[PDB]
Enzyme design. Structure first.
Site, PDB file in Angstrom:
ATOM      1  N   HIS A  40       0.817  -1.221   0.000  1.00 18.09           N
ATOM      2  CA  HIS A  40       0.000   0.000   0.000  1.00 18.09           C
ATOM      3  C   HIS A  40       0.856   1.279   0.000  1.00 18.09           C
ATOM      4  O   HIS A  40       0.323   2.373  -0.170  1.00 18.09           O
ATOM      5  CB  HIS A  40      -1.045  -0.012   1.132  1.00 18.09           C
ATOM      6  CG  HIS A  40      -0.526   0.409   2.475  1.00 18.09           C
ATOM      7  ND1 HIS A  40      -0.187  -0.494   3.460  1.00 18.09           N
ATOM      8  CD2 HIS A  40      -0.349   1.639   3.016  1.00 18.09           C
ATOM      9  CE1 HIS A  40       0.211   0.160   4.536  1.00 18.09           C
ATOM     10  NE2 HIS A  40       0.119   1.457   4.295  1.00 18.09           N
ATOM     11  N   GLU A  52      18.754   7.755   8.552  1.00 20.11           N
ATOM     12  CA  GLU A  52      18.003   8.916   9.020  1.00 20.11           C
ATOM     13  C   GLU A  52      17.697   8.866  10.507  1.00 20.11           C
ATOM     14  O   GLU A  52      17.373   7.809  11.050  1.00 20.11           O
ATOM     15  CB  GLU A  52      16.668   9.010   8.281  1.00 20.11           C
ATOM     16  CG  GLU A  52      16.783   9.425   6.831  1.00 20.11           C
ATOM     17  CD  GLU A  52      16.943  10.924   6.664  1.00 20.11           C
ATOM     18  OE1 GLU A  52      17.291  11.606   7.650  1.00 20.11           O
ATOM     19  OE2 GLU A  52      16.721  11.425   5.549  1.00 20.11           O
ATOM     20  N   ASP A  84       0.123  -7.625   1.859  1.00 17.31           N
ATOM     21  CA  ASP A  84       0.562  -6.227   1.848  1.00 17.31           C
ATOM     22  C   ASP A  84       2.074  -6.137   2.016  1.00 17.31           C
ATOM     23  O   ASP A  84       2.588  -5.786   3.083  1.00 17.31           O
ATOM     24  CB  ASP A  84      -0.172  -5.428   2.928  1.00 17.31           C
ATOM     25  CG  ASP A  84       0.050  -3.926   2.813  1.00 17.31           C
ATOM     26  OD1 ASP A  84       0.592  -3.468   1.783  1.00 17.31           O
ATOM     27  OD2 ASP A  84      -0.326  -3.205   3.764  1.00 17.31           O
ATOM     28  N   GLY A 175       1.723   7.089   8.542  1.00 20.01           N
ATOM     29  CA  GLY A 175       3.105   7.471   8.276  1.00 20.01           C
ATOM     30  C   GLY A 175       4.112   6.434   8.731  1.00 20.01           C
ATOM     31  O   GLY A 175       5.267   6.479   8.313  1.00 20.01           O
ATOM     32  N   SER A 177       3.373   3.302   8.110  1.00 22.53           N
ATOM     33  CA  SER A 177       3.117   2.323   7.046  1.00 22.53           C
ATOM     34  C   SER A 177       4.381   1.832   6.376  1.00 22.53           C
ATOM     35  O   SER A 177       5.226   2.637   5.993  1.00 22.53           O
ATOM     36  CB  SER A 177       2.261   2.954   5.947  1.00 22.53           C
ATOM     37  OG  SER A 177       0.917   3.081   6.343  1.00 22.53           O
ATOM     38  N   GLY A 178       4.490   0.514   6.217  1.00 20.19           N
ATOM     39  CA  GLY A 178       5.598  -0.090   5.494  1.00 20.19           C
ATOM     40  C   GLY A 178       6.814  -0.349   6.360  1.00 20.19           C
ATOM     41  O   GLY A 178       7.748  -1.019   5.931  1.00 20.19           O
TER      42      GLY A 178
END
Ligand SMILES: NCCc1c[nH]c2ccccc12
Ligand SMILES: [Ca+2]
Length: 223
Positions: A40, A52, A84, A175, A177-178
């Site tokens: 997604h 980061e 997903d 945010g 997500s993944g």
């Protein structure tokens, strides 16, 4: 991440930010040239940002590398979010070090009760909206399949698991997500979906990575 803590700069060295002009999803570095994220999170024009902490400031340990290709799982259904998962190949290999490091794929699935680390730059509010600049972390247990299915009737497939707290207050959010769910040094989950964030009896739902190890290895070997 709602109800978490500030990880500390570069303490989660496999955590990546996917950037298309702005941070839009997390991902996990699994070797020098491949990232695992959520299907997604698919879009074109992805730059992978490694090393980061503060995603709004260049702090000196970053590597910015454009994606050469993305591979969404062939059976991904965007309505149900079954399967997903997505692979992203970097145009060049990351320079691996103590602050930019790959995370191991599971050799076995993790059980309910296993303690894991969930991380990301997502919303820190369950009602309001506030996005942190630095990476946030949450320690959370995997929940039983039965409690997960009871929380989300008719929606939990064999490729999903719940992790977090049925009482609410602590969860991944928009945010995140993944991004990674890491347990005992293995990537067991990907931040996938849920009903809001940190709501009572609505724990986060995560892609069950151990089901995809063969696909991941096979795909990397030919791409
Ligand atoms: N547990 C967080 C699941 C999630 C992913 N993306 C979202 C967007 C809005 C609300 C929850 C989510
Ligand atoms: Ca930065």
């Amino acid at each position: 991440i709602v109800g978490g803590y500030t990880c500390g700069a570069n303490t989660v060295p496999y955590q990546v930010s996917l950037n298309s002009g702005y941070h839009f999803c997390g991902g996990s570095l699994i070797n020098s040239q491949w990232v695992v994220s959520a299907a997604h999170c698919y879009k074109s024009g992805i730059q992978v940002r490694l090393g980061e902490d503060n995603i709004n400031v260049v702090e000196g340990n970053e590597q910015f590398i454009s994606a050469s290709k993305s591979i969404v799982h062939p059976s991904y259904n965007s309505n149900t979010l079954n399967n997903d998962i997505m692979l992203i190949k970097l145009k060049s290999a990351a320079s691996l070090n103590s602050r930019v490091a790959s995370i191991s794929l599971p050799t076995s699935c993790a059980s309910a009760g296993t303690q894991c680390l969930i991380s990301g730059w997502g919303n820190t509010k369950s009602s309001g909206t506030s996005y942190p600049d630095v990476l946030k972390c949450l320690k959370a247990p995997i929940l039983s399949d039965s409690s997960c299915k009871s929380a989300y009737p008719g929606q939990i497939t064999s490729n999903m698991f719940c992790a977090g707290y049925l009482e609410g207050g602590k969860d991944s959010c928009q945010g995140d997500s993944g991004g990674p769910v890491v347990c005992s040094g293995k990537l067991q989950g990907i931040v996938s979906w849920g009903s809001g964030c940190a709501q009572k009896n609505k724990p986060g739902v995560y892609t069950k990575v151990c089901n995809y190890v063969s696909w991941i290895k096979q795909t990397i070997a030919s791409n």
